Amino acid sequence: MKASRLYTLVLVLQPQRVLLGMKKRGFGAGRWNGFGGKVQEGETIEDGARRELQEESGLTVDALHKVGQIVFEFVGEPELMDVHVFCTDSIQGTPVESDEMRPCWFQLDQIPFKDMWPDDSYWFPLLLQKKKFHGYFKFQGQDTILDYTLREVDTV
Ligand SMILES: Nc1[nH]c(=O)nc2c1ncn2[C@H]1C[C@H](O)[C@@H](COP(=O)(O)OP(=O)(O)OP(=O)(O)O)O1
Ligand SMILES: [Mn+2]
Ligand SMILES: [Mn+2]
Ligand code: NA
Ligand code: NA
C-alpha cells in the first residue's frame, strides 16, 4: 500500500484544437502538457483544477467536466500521483505565457505526442472520443513505461 497525493490536469479541448502548455521549469519540463498542479487543502478537486488552470494559463472558467483519473508511480518514489483529469466546458479569455507554462494551440491532427508525456499517447485519444477513463502508469524516469493499465469507464 502506497500513499497518494492529489493533482489536477485540465485539457482545454475545443472542436478542432487543444491548448497545451510547454513546461518551462520543474517536473516534466520541456514537454507539452495540460494545465494543473497539486490540490490544496479545503478546495474541491474541481475547484483546484480551475485554480491551477487560471494560475498556469491565465484562463478562467466557471465549470469543468471530469473525464478521467490517472495514477502515476515512479521508480524510487514511494508516493503515487493521483491525477484527476478535466476538460473545459467553455472559455472566455486568452492564454498567457508565464514562468511555468507557455501555452499554444494545436490542431487536432497535429497533437504533439512525441513531445508530451508518453502516457498521453494512450489516454488522450479517449479524451478525443469523449470516453471516460481510469489509468495507471509506472515510469522509470521520465521516458520509460514499465507497466500500465487503461480502462474505459462509465463514471470517473
Ligand atoms: N505522466 C504524466 N502525464 C501527464 O499527462 N501529465 C502529468 C504526468 N505527470 C505529471 N503530470 C501533470 C500533472 C500535474 O498537472 C502536473 C504536476 O503538478 P506539479 O507538481 O507541477 O504541481 P504544482 O505546481 O502544484 O507543485 P509545486 O511545484 O509544489 O507548486 O503535471
Ligand atoms: Mn501550478
Ligand atoms: Mn503545474
Ligand atoms: Na500549485
Ligand atoms: Na507546477
Coordinates of C-alpha atoms and ligand atoms in Angstrom, one line a residue:
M1 CA 0.0 0.0 0.0
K2 CA 1.2 3.4 -1.0
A3 CA 0.1 6.9 -0.2
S4 CA -1.1 9.2 -3.0
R5 CA -1.0 13.0 -3.5
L6 CA -3.8 14.7 -5.4
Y7 CA -3.1 16.6 -8.7
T8 CA -5.2 18.1 -11.4
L9 CA -4.9 18.2 -15.2
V10 CA -7.1 20.3 -17.5
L11 CA -7.3 19.9 -21.2
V12 CA -8.7 23.0 -22.9
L13 CA -10.3 21.0 -25.8
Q14 CA -12.3 22.8 -28.5
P15 CA -13.9 21.2 -31.6
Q16 CA -10.8 21.5 -33.7
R17 CA -7.9 22.3 -31.4
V18 CA -6.4 21.8 -27.9
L19 CA -4.5 24.2 -25.8
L20 CA -1.3 22.8 -24.3
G21 CA 1.5 24.3 -22.2
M22 CA 5.2 23.9 -22.7
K23 CA 6.5 23.3 -19.2
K24 CA 9.3 25.9 -18.7
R25 CA 10.6 24.6 -15.4
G26 CA 10.2 21.8 -12.9
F27 CA 8.5 18.4 -13.2
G28 CA 8.1 17.4 -16.8
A29 CA 10.0 20.4 -18.2
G30 CA 10.4 20.5 -21.9
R31 CA 7.2 18.7 -22.7
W32 CA 3.8 19.9 -23.7
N33 CA 1.1 19.1 -21.1
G34 CA -2.3 20.1 -19.9
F35 CA -2.6 22.6 -17.1
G36 CA -2.7 21.7 -13.4
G37 CA -0.9 21.1 -10.2
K38 CA -1.4 20.0 -6.6
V39 CA -4.8 20.2 -5.0
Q40 CA -4.7 22.4 -1.8
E41 CA -6.4 21.9 1.5
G42 CA -10.1 22.9 1.6
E43 CA -10.9 23.2 -2.1
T44 CA -12.7 20.6 -4.1
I45 CA -10.7 18.8 -6.8
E46 CA -12.7 20.5 -9.5
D47 CA -12.1 23.9 -7.9
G48 CA -8.4 23.2 -7.6
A49 CA -8.4 22.3 -11.3
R50 CA -10.0 25.7 -12.1
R51 CA -7.5 27.5 -9.8
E52 CA -4.5 25.8 -11.4
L53 CA -5.8 26.5 -14.9
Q54 CA -6.0 30.2 -14.1
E55 CA -2.6 30.3 -12.4
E56 CA -0.9 28.4 -15.2
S57 CA -2.6 29.6 -18.4
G58 CA -4.5 32.8 -17.4
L59 CA -7.8 31.2 -18.4
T60 CA -10.7 31.5 -16.1
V61 CA -13.6 29.1 -16.4
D62 CA -16.8 28.6 -14.4
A63 CA -17.0 24.9 -14.7
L64 CA -15.2 21.8 -15.9
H65 CA -16.2 18.3 -16.6
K66 CA -14.3 15.3 -15.3
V67 CA -13.0 13.0 -18.0
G68 CA -10.5 10.6 -16.3
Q69 CA -8.3 9.7 -13.4
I70 CA -4.7 8.5 -13.8
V71 CA -2.4 7.2 -11.1
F72 CA 1.4 7.6 -11.8
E73 CA 4.1 5.7 -10.0
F74 CA 7.8 6.5 -10.4
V75 CA 10.6 4.1 -9.6
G76 CA 12.3 5.3 -6.5
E77 CA 9.4 7.5 -5.3
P78 CA 7.0 5.9 -2.8
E79 CA 4.3 8.5 -3.2
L80 CA 1.8 8.0 -6.0
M81 CA 0.5 10.9 -8.1
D82 CA -3.3 10.7 -8.3
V83 CA -4.2 12.9 -11.2
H84 CA -7.8 14.0 -11.8
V85 CA -8.3 14.9 -15.5
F86 CA -10.8 17.5 -16.6
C87 CA -11.9 19.2 -19.8
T88 CA -13.2 22.7 -20.1
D89 CA -16.9 23.5 -20.8
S90 CA -16.2 26.9 -22.4
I91 CA -13.5 29.6 -22.2
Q92 CA -13.8 33.3 -22.3
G93 CA -10.3 34.9 -22.3
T94 CA -6.8 34.4 -23.9
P95 CA -3.9 32.2 -22.6
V96 CA -0.9 34.0 -21.2
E97 CA 2.8 32.9 -21.1
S98 CA 4.1 32.6 -17.5
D99 CA 7.2 31.5 -15.6
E100 CA 5.9 27.9 -15.7
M101 CA 4.0 27.3 -18.9
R102 CA 4.0 28.7 -22.4
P103 CA 0.5 27.9 -23.8
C104 CA 0.0 27.1 -27.5
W105 CA -2.9 25.8 -29.6
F106 CA -2.6 22.6 -31.6
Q107 CA -4.9 21.4 -34.3
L108 CA -6.4 18.0 -33.5
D109 CA -4.5 16.4 -36.4
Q110 CA -1.2 17.8 -35.0
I111 CA -1.3 16.6 -31.4
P112 CA 2.4 16.7 -30.4
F113 CA 2.5 13.2 -28.9
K114 CA 6.3 12.8 -29.3
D115 CA 6.8 15.9 -27.1
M116 CA 4.2 15.0 -24.5
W117 CA 4.3 12.7 -21.5
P118 CA 4.4 9.1 -23.0
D119 CA 1.2 8.1 -21.3
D120 CA -0.7 10.8 -23.1
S121 CA -0.4 8.7 -26.3
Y122 CA -2.7 6.1 -24.7
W123 CA -5.3 8.1 -22.9
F124 CA -5.6 11.3 -24.9
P125 CA -7.3 9.6 -27.8
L126 CA -10.0 8.5 -25.4
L127 CA -10.5 12.1 -24.4
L128 CA -10.9 13.0 -28.1
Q129 CA -13.6 10.3 -28.5
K130 CA -15.5 11.7 -25.4
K131 CA -14.8 8.5 -23.4
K132 CA -14.1 8.5 -19.7
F133 CA -11.2 6.5 -18.4
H134 CA -9.1 5.2 -15.5
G135 CA -5.4 4.7 -16.0
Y136 CA -2.3 3.7 -14.1
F137 CA 1.3 4.1 -15.4
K138 CA 4.6 3.1 -13.7
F139 CA 7.6 5.1 -15.0
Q140 CA 11.4 4.6 -14.9
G141 CA 12.5 8.2 -15.0
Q142 CA 10.6 10.5 -17.4
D143 CA 10.6 8.4 -20.6
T144 CA 10.1 4.7 -19.9
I145 CA 6.8 3.0 -19.0
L146 CA 7.4 -0.3 -17.2
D147 CA 3.7 -1.2 -16.6
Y148 CA 0.4 0.4 -17.3
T149 CA -3.4 -0.1 -17.2
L150 CA -6.0 1.8 -19.1
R151 CA -9.8 1.2 -18.9
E152 CA -12.8 3.0 -20.3
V153 CA -15.4 3.6 -17.6
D154 CA -18.9 4.8 -17.4
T155 CA -18.3 7.0 -14.3
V156 CA -14.9 8.6 -13.4
Ligands
LIG1 N1 2.9 11.4 -16.7 C1 2.1 12.5 -16.8 N2 1.3 12.7 -17.8 C2 0.6 13.8 -18.0 O1 -0.2 14.0 -19.0 N3 0.6 14.8 -17.0 C3 1.4 14.6 -16.0 C4 2.2 13.5 -15.8 N4 2.9 13.6 -14.7 C5 2.6 14.8 -14.1 N5 1.7 15.4 -14.9 C6 1.0 16.7 -14.7 C7 0.0 16.6 -13.5 C8 0.0 18.0 -13.0 O2 -0.8 18.8 -13.7 C9 1.5 18.4 -13.2 C10 2.4 18.1 -12.0 O3 2.0 19.1 -11.0 P1 3.1 19.9 -10.3 O4 3.9 19.0 -9.4 O5 3.8 20.9 -11.2 O6 2.1 20.8 -9.3 P2 2.3 22.2 -8.5 O7 2.8 23.2 -9.5 O8 1.1 22.4 -7.7 O9 3.5 21.7 -7.5 P3 4.5 22.7 -6.7 O10 5.8 22.7 -7.5 O11 4.6 22.1 -5.3 O12 3.8 24.1 -6.7 O13 2.0 17.6 -14.3
MN2 MN 0.9 25.3 -10.8
MN3 MN 1.9 22.9 -12.7
NA4 NA 0.1 24.5 -7.2
NA5 NA 3.9 23.2 -11.4

